[PDB]
Amino acid sequence: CKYKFENWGACDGGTGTKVRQGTLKKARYNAQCQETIRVTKPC
DSSP states (O other), rough: OOOEEOOOOSSSSSSEEEEEEEEOOOOSSSOOSSSSSSOOOOO
16 A cells, blocks of 8 residues: 555545545555545544
8 A cells, every 4th residue: 555645634625524535555444445545534
């Protein structure tokens, strides 16, 4: 897993949870860690 996308900040933003699409360095949220993906976590 790597990390190259919009980083995170705080739940919310226009959808509900914090989602960052793109290379995600396993945030421990998606679990499978599909690196490039719009992940989420809180709300």
